[PDB]
Write a protein that binds this ligand. Structure first.
Ligand SMILES: [Mg+2]
Length: 140
RNA sequence: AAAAGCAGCCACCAAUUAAGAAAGCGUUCAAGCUCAACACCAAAAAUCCCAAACAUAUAACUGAACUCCUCACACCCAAUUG
């Protein structure tokens, strides 16, 4: 019916997360990989991009890609790749306010990513809480 | 190389208008099914089980050599004794 993937854009086509996991349901991996590579080339690579693949009963696909994620997104915005081993103890990310405003503004895009709130405060609160759960803390 | 929500540890925020970084079930692994919440909502052993038997007429009856009623009283213990 519907599957949710998070394979990295730059990553061409692995095996487990796109081979047997999908073969059990019968698919055409060629077209899926081609569309994924096209969407990856359409924008700078090196960032995960979710997707809402719509598996039709006629063995046809209609991929629906979106904006980057939140984990790696904030990890790259703060400047640290690997996260903390124990949070919130092992602090790491220390983001200011202007960067948070900018990242929230550029994230406020795809409606499929839960954008049922008119103001942006409610939306940015979610990513702020997610960062708090991570080894990142909001400065100022 | 993997556990993403349950091989192991951390904090467990918070957007859905209004509620789990997940309380179970099932997944190598994700897939699927529920829940927390919201909208009216005790019996068994060998000859054969063993007293008939009734729930609905007024709390009181029956029941000794125990006590009493007429008379006179020494006349219900092993061994032993007087
Ligand atoms: Mg007498």
């Amino acid at each position: 019916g519907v599957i949710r993937a998070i394979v990295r854009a730059g990553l061409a086509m692995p095996g487990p997360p796109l081979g047997p996991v999908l073969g059990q349901r019968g698919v055409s991996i060629n077209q899926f990989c081609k569309e994924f590579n096209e969407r990856t080339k359409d924008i700078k690579e090196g960032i995960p991009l979710p997707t809402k693949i719509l598996v039709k009963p006629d063995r046809t696909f209609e991929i629906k890609i979106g904006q980057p994620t939140v984990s790696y997104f904030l990890k790259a915005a703060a400047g640290i790749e690997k996260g903390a081993r124990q949070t919130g103890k092992e602090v790491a990310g220390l983001v200011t306010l202007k960067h948070v405003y900018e990242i929230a503004r550029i994230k406020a895009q795809d409606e499929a990513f839960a954008l049922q709130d008119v103001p942006l405060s409610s939306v940015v609160r979610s990513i702020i809480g997610s960062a708090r759960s991570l080894g990142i803390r909001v400065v100022k």
